[PDB]
Amino acid sequence: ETAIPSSTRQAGIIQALQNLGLCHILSVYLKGLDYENKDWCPELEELHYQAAWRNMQWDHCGTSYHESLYNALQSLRDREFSTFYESLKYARVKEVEEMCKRSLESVYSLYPTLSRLQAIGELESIGELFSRSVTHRQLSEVYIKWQKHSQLLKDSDFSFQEPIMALRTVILEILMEKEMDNSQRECIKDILTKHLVELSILARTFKNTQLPERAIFQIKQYNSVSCGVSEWQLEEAQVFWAKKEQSLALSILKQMIKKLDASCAANNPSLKLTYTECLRVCGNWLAETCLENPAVIMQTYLEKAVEVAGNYDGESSDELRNGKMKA
Amino acid sequence: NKDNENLYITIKLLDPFPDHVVFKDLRITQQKIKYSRGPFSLLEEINHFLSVSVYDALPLTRLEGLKDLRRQLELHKDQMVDIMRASQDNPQDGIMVKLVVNLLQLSKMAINHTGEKEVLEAVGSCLGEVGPIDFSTIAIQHSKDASYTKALKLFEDKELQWTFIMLTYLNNTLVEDCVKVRSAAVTCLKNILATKTGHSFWEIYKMTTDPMLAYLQPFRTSRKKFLEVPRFDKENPFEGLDDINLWIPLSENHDIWIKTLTCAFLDSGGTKCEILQLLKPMCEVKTDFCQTVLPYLIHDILLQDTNESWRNLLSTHVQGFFTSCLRHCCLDKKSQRTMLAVVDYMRRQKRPSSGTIFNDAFWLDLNYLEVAKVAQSCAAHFTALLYAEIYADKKSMDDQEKRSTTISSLSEKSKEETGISLQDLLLEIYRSIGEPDSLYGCGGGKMLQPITRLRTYEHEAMWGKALVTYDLETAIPSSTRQAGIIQALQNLGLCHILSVYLKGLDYENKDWCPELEELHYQAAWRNMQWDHCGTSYHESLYNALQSLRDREFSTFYESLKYARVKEVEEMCKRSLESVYSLYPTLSRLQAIGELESIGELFSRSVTHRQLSEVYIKWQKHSQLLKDSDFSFQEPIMALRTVILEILMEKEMDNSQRECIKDILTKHLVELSILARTFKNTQLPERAIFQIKQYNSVSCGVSEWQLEEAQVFWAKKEQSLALSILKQMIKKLDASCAANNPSLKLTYTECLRVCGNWLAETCLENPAVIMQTYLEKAVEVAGNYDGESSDELRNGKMKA
Amino acid sequence: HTLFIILALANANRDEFLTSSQLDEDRTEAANRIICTIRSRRPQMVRSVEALCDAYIILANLDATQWKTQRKGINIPADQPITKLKNLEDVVVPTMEIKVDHTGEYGNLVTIQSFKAEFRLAGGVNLPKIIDCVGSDGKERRQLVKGRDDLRQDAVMQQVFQMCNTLLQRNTETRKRKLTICTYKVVPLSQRSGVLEWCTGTVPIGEFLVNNEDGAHKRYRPNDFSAFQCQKKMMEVQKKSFEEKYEVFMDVCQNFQPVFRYFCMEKFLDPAIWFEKRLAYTRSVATSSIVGYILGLGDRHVQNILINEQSAELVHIDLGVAFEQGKILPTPETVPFRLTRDIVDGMGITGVEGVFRRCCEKTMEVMRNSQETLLTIVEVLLYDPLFDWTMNPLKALYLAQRPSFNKVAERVLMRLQEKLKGVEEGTVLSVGGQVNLLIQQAIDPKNLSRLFPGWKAWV
Ligand SMILES: Nc1ncnc2c1ncn2[C@@H]1O[C@H](COP(=O)(O)OP(=O)(O)NP(=O)(O)O)[C@@H](O)[C@H]1O
Ligand SMILES: [Mg+2]
Ligand SMILES: [Zn+2]
């Protein structure tokens, strides 16, 4: 459609593109618009800044929300803490101002501001950790705090949670691209991998398939394939299952099970939960697809998962108790 | 000599003379001598055209016949439906597909010859009249001489069959310009016919009727003592052939390689048959003869092989040659094809020991996996597939014997032994074949890599999934990374997005590869971006469209002529073995032909009758493509929409442009219906929008509005579709009063569709649905008394 | 197309004439009235055909048990009236398929000219006679005459195959793949004897594979177990435990490798032709298996399946058992269709994956999309008074030998309906899921072990 005003025409296009991923396409599409048009309206300025910080286009460089967020991230990159807090303070003070002049009658009107203020607070909270030395204990507490606040948003809409998760991924990945000569960056890599797995799970719940695929790709950038399988690989099989690709999901898990059988010998407690869950999921998928007889499914996948969870005697744990119940 | 009865048959089959004043008198004589029996139908014209091909192998002499064949195909498109309706029972020998193969073979013969441009253009024009019609066949077959095949059946002895093949080749090579070849051949005829085997050949072959017998009468002589071929006992017959350098010189000199390899076999004392020893002088002057005789020589040696000494020597040398092909050295394609013919010939021969066909496939101890890869490299797709199955079967039997495994498992051993993955090899073999169902047979290899996933999405028309994967993955080469992106964007519509995306790429990159010219030109002409302004296909199409607007007809025909010629040349150099390879060429040639046909209408005055005939011709040819894939029909429909829109943007001060508007509206409705059938929703929505640009909303509803409701129904939006039709029915009730016959069909269909939709959605009780929608549709079509029509009869049946 | 139909009804009791319920006499009397109405305007055609029909019945009633060991051809006795009749220009060959035209005038049709004096015999519990019919064009046609058997059930099954063929043709998805069912004309002549088309150029799959003299298994795998050895072992474990049956079946399958893939290799040396024939074979098996499952076809043993030598397309014969009556046998049929190792091996290295699975899915989609049509046709068949599709102890014992109607029809219709909607075990299954279940059940070794040895599951 072309009769729609141009100002909102590309606003919807950019917003639709972002929700489907297509980060490279959106970047080129934004560049094409700037080439053909010299006048640069603020609402297109708002989206361009939003895409720049989401895609880590750090070479692009009153102030608006995404402009402050993009400026603060570069200030975080350059260790310019004086302006980093000032930009966040201006954004925090600004965002309340529009909320003041509204009607304040509908609860749904408060949600976009609360999500934005939460994102500002998380960026401010991680700033003190960035300024001082990086330690495992501080990183674990921040992730635990993020997880505890995330479960409080379990009933929130995906539109109010996605920007929060996007900033968390950007913040964590900014930490990794910092110089670390202490060789302890694996802690951040594990935290980012866990965060991206949670993002894939959250997006899968809201019937979204493009975002989980992007999260899996981001994980594979910082992770590799080894003898000991990991949880994000299992998440990829679940993501492909949600994409109505049953052959792809089953092939991933069958390869994963074969590797687990050859690798572990009831010696790794960490791989015990992954092995038990993977056998249970594959058996359920085969039963639903009716691609195997009940005798083989029970003998190879279902009872094997129960045997692995029970006979290994790796007791005294809470996750394993949940694993046995599902098995 | 028209009255001559013995010359009556041949004068009928000669090619028509060119249309000129000097050839006047001969023309009426030929037209009468051919049409003496009566008028020829389209099938008879095709059958007559094919018979002339087997006589003379000069494409220049067939130029007039190609133009004549084009005329019949253009004005007899109605009979092609009946011809196809007569050939689905046996589609292997379909008449239409044989014509396509024969024309392409004729184009190959015209390559590297004087006057090759006009003959290729005529073939392309002929291949433009018939599009990518589903021939219901996968493998391309070549015409074979029935008499030659019959003559082979007469001789039972293998040596006698060897004699007939050689003399037939020797008789054939007696008419070339070379005099040394002729002298060498005649000496061979004297030597072969003087032997006992040649004498035995004549007695068996004299019963049948063949001109070669009369040609060989002077060479034959009667002697009391039969010619004796001397036999020499070499001290070590294997020293000549036991040379790795001799088998693989490969110094970019195939002519001397085949000659030296053949000569070494002749000088070896292993050969027992007498006729072969006498072929040396002819082998030394022709390389083609050496390639032909080589399988017979190798077959001959293994017959009297003792203690498997020759078999072991040949097995390791042939295998060594094949292993050299798998390197990266840089062997010529001619050498590999010659050895493939040797392997293929030996596979059809019965071994002296009693056995089956599987045993006969192992005359030499060869690894068929390497041969299959070479065959795939030589574009022998079906040959490679058969060899791969033989290789897998042999190793499975070998493994079972050794012990006294799935496709993924067997491929693992193949990779660790010879470096070739069997399951990976089977992938491009099936892709080269192009059969859609066979692609799923071997897919377990390389599941997770994005490249394999992207082809699956493109094959299944999952353009949204492919678009996301293309953007996400970065390790894929950039040249094909965007090539998929523009291709995926175009199939989803997004014309404005694609235009901006293309502009963004040009801004960030200065170096510009040619395959991005092809897509940018494709998008420019599809989106009517006329301000963008060897030559490629879409470049010629875009240039011709601008030439069409500017009324520059001299370059418009020249650009189309160059595009038509260029398409055939790329078509000639391929394998020409798979029918699916023909479809992309036929579809592009059809689009060129349609644009050329419109040019004459555009140049002269525009009239209602001319436009109506063109649309009837378009619809007549469109239903011939009803079984074609959407990928081969969409570009044709896209060009039709553009050129119709080019006509509308022209100035018309006669106020008769409503005729073109109606044709475009009908064409876009058909495009929406065709896209809806192929489970496409973006294209029908775009077609509806294009209709609304040139159409409005009035008291009298139209058919495209009903199409929009059907499009929205296909988009799983039932409330939108029902609301459109309910408003449409309400206007129809108030507007028409059983006075407009045109609105009768629309009103009857609309009530029937809405009632069916309500029944499926269960949004209304049965009593109201019958009283308001179903019986009313029957009533409207029934008591209006607008009879004497065919569309109403179809409408009444549906109601 | 109808004159042979009415005479067969009117000649129900002519078998004993040449040598029950009130509905029988009423049908016979009404059929006679139609014949007299037919004979009123065209008497020469009626008299000519009934003479041909009588000749077939007399020829069928011939015992001819002495020439059981002869396979070269036996001269027809001069007492048979079929030899006397010649040049029947008013009789169209019943074996041939007659195209139906809108106009009432029929012209240029192939008529019966004469019959050859030599007839052959086919193996079986009875001795059917193979005769040659010469048409007007002079082209010989082979006809199979069967005695002591009901041929009306086979004729009914042929029409359903035509409906399945017609349904597959009108869908673009299956018309592109040329998914069709091989059919042969069946012309019943009485309640006890009949004549049917003989598929020229076709050989039984069992004759090609497990022949004692020149079987495919013997020729290609001499070191493996012989066909007799495998048959003997299965019969021994018949009166044993289920576990013993399973381990015997695995042991036999270990020493019996499929060799059916060599059928196309030895008959089509050209790689292009060989690929076409193999693709046609895979498509034919996939189409027949889905249709056979839909109609509940049973007793699909080696001798009931024919393969065309020229076209490599499977032909299904002996269609008396259908509508899942095979599960009612003393040895239940636990496989919807025959997908043994030989069948899968002939499909190529890919096996069931690829062409076979996609073609099965495409066929199932057509069956699902035409559910209302398919259910209506079966409803007409199931209420036919003369259609004896229900299983009886006499038929059950004959099929497996060793040395209220309304409630059943409704249950069969309900079972057919749930199949067409994808309901298998009370759950809704998609086309892909249903096809996967059918393929898995057919190739399951455990189900094959329970089956009757005469079905030759290992083959
Ligand atoms: N229509 C046919 N076309 C070709 N061959 C056929 C045909 N019908 C039967 N045969 C052959 O006849 C053999 C015996 O089968 P058949 O004629 O059905 O007698 P049968 O085995 O006794 N069947 P039945 O009488 O029901 O027990 C088969 O193995 C085929 O080789
Ligand atoms: Mg039988
Ligand atoms: Zn090289």
Side-chain angles (χ1 to χ4, degrees), chain C residues 123 144 146 149 184 196-199 204 303 306 317-318 398:
Chain C
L144 183 62
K146 186 180 289 293
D149 187 74
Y184 55 98
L196 58 85
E197 193 189 300
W198 179 269
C199 304
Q303 288 297 128
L306 295 174
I317 68 161
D318 198 312
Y398 164 97

Side-chain angles (χ1 to χ4, degrees), chain B residues 605-667:
Chain B
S605 300
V606 74
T607 43
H608 196 321
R609 297 285 75 78
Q610 292 179 356
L611 183 63
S612 299
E613 293 179 354
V614 163
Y615 189 70
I616 286 165
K617 187 266 183 182
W618 282 359
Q619 285 318 117
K620 182 62 65 68
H621 193 193
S622 276
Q623 65 182 177
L624 270 166
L625 287 197
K626 67 182 290 294
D627 282 324
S628 296
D629 278 12
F630 191 61
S631 58
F632 312 129
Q633 292 194 69
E634 207 271 322
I636 303 166
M637 308 288 252
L639 192 45
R640 289 169 171 182
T641 309
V642 168
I643 62 170
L644 285 173
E645 274 179 351
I646 301 299
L647 294 174
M648 293 177 71
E649 66 182 2
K650 182 176 71 68
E651 60 87 19
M652 283 73 74
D653 312 329
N654 200 28
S655 282
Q656 57 93 39
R657 66 214 314 286
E658 300 296 278
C659 182
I660 303 183
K661 198 171 77 70
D662 291 331
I663 300 299
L664 176 66
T665 313
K666 292 192 298 190
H667 160 74

Side-chain angles (χ1 to χ4, degrees), chain C residues 39-209:
Chain C
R39 196 197 284 108
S40 73
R41 293 181 67 188
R42 294 179 67 187
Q44 70 275 16
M45 183 177 177
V46 177
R47 186 178 65 246
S48 79
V49 176
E50 62 86 20
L52 172 74
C53 283
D54 292 337
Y56 277 145
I57 300 181
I58 292 161
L59 188 153
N61 280 261
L62 185 48
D63 173 44
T65 189
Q66 42 269 48
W67 308 299
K68 182 174 73 175
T69 47
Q70 305 190 350
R71 285 297 170 279
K72 43 185 279 187
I74 306 91
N75 272 281
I76 297 170
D79 186 74
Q80 306 293 312
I82 190 167
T83 315
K84 279 76 175 176
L85 59 87
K86 293 181 176 67
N87 297 95
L88 319 170
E89 84 276 8
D90 58 357
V91 191
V92 165
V93 177
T95 300
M96 293 177 70
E97 182 65 26
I98 297 91
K99 299 298 293 295
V100 187
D101 50 20
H102 295 354
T103 186
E105 191 275 331
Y106 277 88
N108 73 348
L109 275 171
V110 177
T111 78
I112 293 178
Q113 180 192 336
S114 87
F115 288 88
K116 297 291 180 68
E118 293 179 353
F119 82 93
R120 285 86 169 94
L121 293 174
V125 65
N126 59 5
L127 276 298
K129 296 183 204 52
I130 311 175
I131 59 150
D132 292 331
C133 184
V134 176
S136 296
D137 60 356
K139 186 182 287 185
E140 293 83 4
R141 281 145 189 110
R142 295 178 66 88
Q143 316 184 329
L144 183 62
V145 182
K146 186 180 289 293
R148 187 176 64 246
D149 187 74
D150 186 37
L151 292 203
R152 186 178 184 271
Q153 284 152 96
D154 291 331
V156 175
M157 294 299 291
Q158 290 304 319
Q159 293 179 356
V160 191
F161 282 2
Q162 287 162 44
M163 314 282 144
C164 285
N165 279 326
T166 302
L167 286 175
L168 288 171
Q169 293 179 356
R170 78 195 195 173
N171 296 115
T172 56
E173 294 293 328
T174 51
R175 186 187 338 107
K176 279 178 71 77
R177 282 150 180 94
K178 293 186 286 185
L179 304 184
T180 187
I181 297 169
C182 285
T183 57
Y184 55 98
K185 185 58 162 307
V186 184
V187 181
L189 309 158
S190 82
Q191 264 171 344
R192 182 68 179 271
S193 74
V195 65
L196 58 85
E197 193 189 300
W198 179 269
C199 304
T200 61
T202 65
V203 65
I205 62 166
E207 294 293 328
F208 174 82
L209 283 166

Side-chain angles (χ1 to χ4, degrees), chain A residues 225-259:
Chain A
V225 176
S226 299
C227 300
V229 299
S230 63
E231 297 278 354
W232 65 262
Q233 293 157 68
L234 177 53
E235 179 55 38
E236 170 180 38
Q238 291 275 353
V239 167
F240 273 122
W241 188 264
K243 291 174 70 175
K244 299 289 95 176
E245 294 172 49
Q246 304 180 331
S247 66
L248 277 296
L250 278 162
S251 66
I252 290 177
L253 210 44
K254 280 172 192 178
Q255 183 62 255
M256 185 180 289
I257 281 162
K258 182 174 72 68
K259 291 174 70 175

